[PDB]
User: Which sequence fits this backbone?
C-alpha cells in the first residue's frame, strides 16, 4: 500500500479539529502574521524501524497565536490531538507523542505557543505473502 | 541469468489434510532449510600420507520458519491439527516469483511455539524435522503447483 | 481477516484456588509459550534411499512470563500459594482484544524468581512446566471465560 | 494516560516558585528585555526510554536578569526547582536534573543568568493490564 | 495498590552474630532472588493422549547481591565472619519504603567475590545458597523488623 | 497429500516400525473374565530361548562342531510405575501369594492384534522407592508351557 | 479449576504415581509399642523371589520346558544418611548385636496405608564416610517367612 | 538469629547429618599408649555382616522360606594420601610384617565421641602411584572377634 | 612481492561430474579453509624438566563457503547432484588475480543449507569435509587450470 | 566512613624469594578475587516441608590480575621465576590509600599469559590459585607492610 | 625503565629447515602466548582449617598468531612444509625495539587456517602447540638473533 | 615469605603429599652393578596382601568369627610408554625369557629414599599399539619371598 503523503494527514487533522472543537484552523504556513489564530505546520516525515509492519512517523507543528494567554485553548488542542483522529481507509493511527520543540514565546504584540506532535501511522504489515 | 532471488519471493507451503489445497502459511517472515550429511571414519593406519580418511554417511534435513501469527488463517488451523494428531505433513518451498517449486517432502512438526511481546505483534515459530527424502525440485522435473 | 494480533492483547490468566475467578496476572510484560515434540529414530538400512528416517515422539509444553512485580495484588499472592502448596495450577491464554481463549491447561510453577535492580523497577519472572495436555482453544469449541 | 503539555508544567512550576519563594516569575518569553526580572523559557519535551513506565522529559530554562550580581537569589531558584513541585493527579515527577546550557553573561547594561533544567515525569507504567 | 515497587527500595538485611541487630548490607546495588522446583517424569504409556506427564519436584532457592564494597562497614565485617566460620546466616528482604518484609531464611555464603577496576570503584558480589525453607513474609503474618 | 505423490508417499504397504508405546502386557483375572492392562507399564522384555545339544562325531569330514536344537523355554520381564491400589496390581500379588499359574498376553493396542499368550509363574515381584524419584515395580514371569505366538496363529484379539 | 474442567481435569480417579519421598521403613522397638522411622532414609528396595522347579518329562507333546512354583523368600535393602544418636539407629544396632528378629513395616505417609510387614534379621549393617560427602549407612534385612502384604489385607495402618 | 525464630530455626534437636570430614580412623601404637590418626585419610568403609542359616522344613504352613541368623563378621577399608615418614604409616608397617593384631578405633573428631573399637589385622596394605596425581594408599583390616560399638556402650572417648 | 592478496580475488571452484569443466560457485561471498592437526600427549614422568610433552597426530581439512544463491546456476546444479549421490567431489581454490591455484582435493558435501530473509536476498552455505589429503598448490608445482 | 574505595588504590603485591621485599606487580590494570565454598545436598525426605537441605562444603580462592606488561621490571622478573620453578608465592592485596592490607596467602601461578595486539601495548594476564587459607586482614590485626 | 612495550614491536620468528635463518612471519597482526600449569588437589580432611589444599601440577604452553596472508612470502613457504611434514619447528618471540629475545621453544603447527572475505584481505591464523619446554629468554642470558 | 609468616606458612613440618611423578621402579641388571629406571614409566601399583585363617570354635561366647592371619604375598603392576631400544626394556625381556629372578626396587627420586626392594618374577610382559596413540607396555611382577620395606629399615638408597 503506497505511503501516505503529509497532505492527507493535514486534511485529516484539520477535519478532526474543526469537527470536535469548532476550531477554524489553517494549513498554509506563514511567517509574519497578525491577529489571534491557529495554524498547522508540517515539519517532516520519515520511516520508523519495526520488523513487523510498514510504519511511518509524521512530525507536524501547531502554532496558536493570541493576544492573551489562553491556557484552555492550548490544553484543548493538546487533548484533541492526543486523542487521535480518523484516517483514509487502509491506514492505522498507532501512537501520538510529543517531540521536538515545545515553546511559549511572545512576539510583536501577541503570544505565540508552538506545540509539536509526532504521530505514527501503519500502512501494511511486513510479511511475505 | 537472474543473479539473485529476493528472499521475499520464496515461501513455505503446507498441504491440507486431503491434499487438495496448498496453503501458504500466513505471516511468513523468515525461513531456513538445513540439509546435512554425516561423516564416517575410515582412518586406518596402513596408509601413507598423514591425513585423516573420511566417507559420507546419512543425510537428513529440517526447516525453520517464523513470522507473524494469526490464529484464524486456515494455514495455522491446519498446523495445529497436524501437531496434535502426530500425522506426517507435506511441505513444499515455492519461489512465487519464478513460479517454480524448490523442495518438497514429508516432515514432522517438532515444535510449534510463539511469543507475545507487549510492544510488538505476537510472533510464531515452527520447526519441521525431516521425514525421509527431501526431493530437490530444482534438479528434478515437475513440482510446480502454485497455491 | 486480522493479519496480525498485537502483543499487548495476549495475556496470561490463572484460576484461583476455588476456581471461581480467572485472575489476570498483574504486571505482565512478556509471554512465551513453548510446545515441543520428540523425534524418534528408526533408521534401518534395509530401506532404499539415503535419508535418515524419523517419526514424531512425545509432546511437552511450558510457559514463561515476566514483567513488573506487584506484591499486594490478588494474582501474585495466589502464585505464591500454588508454588508453596505444590499444587497444579490452571492457566489460560486470553486474547483480550478478540475476546477468544487460546490455550488452557494444568501447569506446575517450576520457577518463581525476580530481580531488584537499583535504577529500575523490581521485576519478576515465572516459569510453568506443562503437566499433560495443552488444549488448543483456537481449534476446539468453547473456552471463553474472560476475566 | 495522555501526556502533559509543556504549558501545564510551566504553570505548575510557576505556581510552586511563587508560592514557596515569593517570586514573580512569568512564563511568556521575551527577547529584548529591560529592568530586572525572572522568566521561564520552555525548550522542548521528548519521550525518554525506560521499558517499565511511560516517562517524558521536559527541558526548560530560567532566565534571571539583574542590574547587579544577584547570587543567593539564583541559588534559591535552583534549590527550589531541584526539590520538586506539585503536578496534577496521575503524574509523578521522577527526577529533576540540570541539562543543556548553564550560562552567566553580561548584556546591554545588566547581568543575565540562564539556568536550564530537565525534569522527568512518569504518566503511567508500561504494562499490559 | 501501588501498581509497582521502585527497585531502589528492595534491600537485603543480615542478622548479626547474636541476632540483635539487622544490618542492611552496605553498598547494595543489585539483588536477585531465585526460587526453583524440580520436575519428575511419570510418563506411563498405557494412558491415552499424547502429552508428557510431570509432577512437582524438589524446591530450593538462592540469592545474589552485588554492589560497591566498603571494608570498614559493620555489615561487611559480619559476612566475612559467617563465610569463614561455615555458619548459617539469617537473611531477610526488606521493602524499606513500605516497611514490609518479603522473604527470610537461613543461607550459606556460597560465594564472596569482588573485583577492582582501574578507572572505577571497588565492587563486590555475594551469593547465598538456601539452607531449607525460604519463608515468604507477604502471605504470612509478622516479620517486619526494619533496621 | 498430492502432486501425484511426487515427494510425499503415504501409501500403506508396511509399518516399518512399531512404537514401543503401542505394546502392552495384559493379565487375566482369577475368574478369567477380565483382561487387566498392568497400570504404569514402562518396560517390556520377552525372552525365548532354545538349548543346543552337541553330537560331534570324531569320524565326520570337515572340522566343525555339529549340534541340534535343545529344549525351548520363555519368560517375560516387566517394570514400570507402581500404585498399590490398581486392580491389575491387586491381581499380581494374589497370584504371587497363591502360587497360581497366571495367563498373560502381549497386546499391540494400536493394531488391535495379539502377539503372545501363555501360562506363567510369577518368579519375581520386586519394587523400589527412590527418594528423588517415583516408586517403581519390577516383575519377572517364568514361562510354564508353550508361548503361543498369536502372530502366526489365528485369533487372540481381546483388547481389554 | 473450572470451565467445567474443559482443559483442567481436577477429577481424582487414581494416583497414577506414588512419589518415592512417601514410602518409608518403620521398625518396632524392643517393647513393640513404638514404631520408629529410620532416620536419614534415602533409598529403599524390596525383593521378593520365588524358586522354579522344573518337571520336564520326556514324554510330553509340545516342545517347551515345564516348570512349577517353588519356595518364596524376601529381603529389604535400605540406605540413607547416618546420625549416631538417633533413637532408630540406636535400636538397629541392638538387634544386630543380640541376633534378635526385628519387626519391620513399609509405610506410605501420604496414603496413611500400610504396605508390607514382617520379621527380619539385619544381615548387613555397613556404612561409609567419604571425606567430601556426608557419612551414609546401608542396612540389609533378610526375612524368615511370610512378608504379609498389607495392600490386600485388612488392618496394619499404624503411622509412627 | 531472632524475630522469635519466625523464619530462621537453629534450635538443636539433632544433627541431621554428619560430615565425612569429621570421621577418622585411628590406631593404637605398639605400647598401646598413643592413639595415632592415620594421615591422609580420604575414604572409609566399615562393613558388618551376619550369616543366615536356612531351616526350611517341608512341613510348615504358609508358603515362605524360614531363616535364622548365623555368625557375625566385620572389616574396615580406608584409603587416602600416603606419606612415608608419618608415625601412623611408620606403625602400620610394623604391624604388617610382624603379623601382630592392631587396636583400631573409629572416632568422630567433631562430637568428640568414639564409635567402634576392635582388634584387626592388616590383610591388605597396598598403594598406587599414578604419574599425574599424588601417590595413594589403601588398607584393608579384618577383625578377630567382636567389633564393640561405642554408641551403645559407655566409654571409649580418648581422642588423639 | 604483493604484501597482500585482496579477498575478492580468491574463489572456490568445483569439478563437474566428468571433470571436464572447472566451474566457479556462482554467488560466492565468503570462504574459510580449515586445516588442523591432532596432538598426542607423551608425558612419561621419568623425564626431568617440568613441561608437558606432545607429538603430532593426524591432519584434517574442511571448507566453509557462503554467499548469494541462484537456483539455475550449473555449479549450484552440480553441488546438488554431488550432495544427493554421496559421491566424492573435486574442489579447488583459485586466486583469479595471479591466476595461481592454491588447494585442490577430494571432499564430501557435509552440509548444503540455505536461508532466506524477508528483507534480503536468499543466501546459501556449503560445508565440505576433507576426504583425505589436501595438496597445497603453493608448494607443489602445477595446478593452474583457470575456469 | 568512606562509603566507597577507589579501584586505583587496591593493588596486588608478591614476596620475593627471600621474602624480604614486597614488590607490587608493575603494570596492573585489573584485579579479581574469587572466594568460593561448596554445598553438599543432604535431603532426607523423612522431613516435613518441601525444600532442599544443604550444608557448606570446602572453601577455595583464586586471583585474576591483568595489565600492561613490561619485561625489565623486577617484579615481573619474580613471577616468571616462580612460574618456572614451581615454588609457592606469597601474595598480598593492599589498599595503598588507607595503608591497610586486605588478604594474604600462598598461591601457585596457574596461568601466565600475555597479549601483543598490533595497535596496542603488550598486555599480560596472571592467574593465582591458592593452596589453602586466604587469611583476610580486614578482621584480624596485622599485615600492614605497604612497599 | 620503559613503563610499556608497544605491541607493534613484538614479533614471531621461525627457524627454517636448515636453521640458518630466523624468519619474521609476514603479515603479523596478533600474538598470544598462553602458558598454563595444572593444579593437583590434595584435600585430605584430617587437616584443620576449612580451605581446599592444592599443589602445582604440570606445565604447558601454546602460541596463537593471526595476520595478513601473502602466500608467496618465503616465510609462509616454511610454515606449510613444517605443517605437511609433521616436523617440529623452532619458534622465537622477538622484541625488535629492545633487540632482545623473549621466548624460544620447539612447537608443532597444530592449526593453520585462513579466511577470505570478499570485502577485506585474506587473513591467516596459526596455532602452535608446545612440545616441551618454553625457554624464557627474559631471565636467561643469550638468545638475541634478530633476522 | 615474611611478615612473621602471618598468612604464609613456609615452615616444612611434613610433606602432606607425594606426587606420583617422584615414585619410580628400578631394576638390577644381569651383572647386578647398575640400577636402571624403567623408561617410559607412567603408572605403578604395589599390592601387599595377607591371608586370613579362620579359627572359629563353636564354644566361644560372642557371635563373631575368630580369625588369624596367614601368609603374605606382594606383587607389582607397572605400565607406560614403550621404546624398544631402551636399556631397561632390553634387560626385562632377557629376564622374562631366562626365568631369572629380577631384583626390583621402588625409589622416591625426589626425597632420595628407597622404599621397597625384593626379588620378583616377570609373570606378564604385554604391550598394546592403539592406532591413534603411542605403543604402550604393561609389566606384572610376582614376588618370590619377602618384600623388604626400606621405610622401616636403614639403607637401600642406590639412586640410579
Assistant:
Amino acid at each position: 500500500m503506497k505511503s501516505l503523503s503529509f497532505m492527507r494527514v493535514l486534511e485529516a487533522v484539520r477535519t478532526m479539529l474543526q469537527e470536535k472543537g469548532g476550531l477554524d484552523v489553517s494549513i498554509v504556513m506563514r511567517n509574519q502574521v497578525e491577529m489571534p489564530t491557529t495554524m498547522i505546520e508540517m515539519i517532516d516525515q520519515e520511516e520508523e524501524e519495526s520488523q513487523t509492519a510498514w510504519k511511518e512517523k509524521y512530525r507536524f507543528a501547531i502554532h496558536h497565536y493570541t493576544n492573551e494567554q489562553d491556557l484552555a485553548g492550548v490544553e484543548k488542542i493538546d487533548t484533541l490531538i492526543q486523542m487521535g483522529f480518523i484516517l483514509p481507509e487502509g491506514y492505522k493511527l498507532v501512537a501520538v507523542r510529543h517531540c521536538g520543540k515545545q515553546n511559549l514565546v511572545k512576539e510583536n504584540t501577541l503570544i505565540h505557543a508552538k506545540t509539536s506532535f509526532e504521530v505514527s501511522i501503519c500502512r501494511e504489515l511486513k510479511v511475505k505473502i | 541469468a537472474a543473479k539473485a532471488v529476493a528472499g521475499k519471493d520464496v515461501i513455505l507451503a503446507v498441504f491440507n489434510a486431503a491434499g487438495d489445497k496448498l496453503l501458504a502459511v500466513a505471516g511468513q517472515q523468515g525461513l531456513t532449510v538445513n540439509r546435512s550429511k554425516d561423516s564416517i571414519e575410515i582412518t586406518s593406519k596402513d596408509t601413507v600420507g598423514g591425513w585423516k580418511s573420511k566417507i559420507g554417511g546419512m543425510k537428513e534435513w529440517s526447516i525453520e520458519n517464523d513470522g507473524l501469527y494469526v490464529a484464524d488463517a486456515e494455514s495455522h488451523k491446519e498446523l495445529a491439527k497436524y501437531f496434535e494428531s502426530d500425522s506426517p505433513v507435506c511441505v513444499k518451498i515455492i519461489n512465487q516469483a519464478s513460479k517454480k517449486g524448490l523442495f518438497g517432502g514429508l516432515a514432522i512438526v517438532a515444535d510449534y511455539s510463539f511469543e507475545a511481546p507487549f510492544d510488538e505483534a505476537m510472533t510464531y515459530s515452527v520447526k519441521l524435522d525431516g521425514m525421509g527424502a527431501l526431493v530437490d525440485l530444482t534438479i528434478t522435473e515437475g513440482g510446480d503447483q502454485m497455491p
Notes: Chain I has one helix and eight strands.
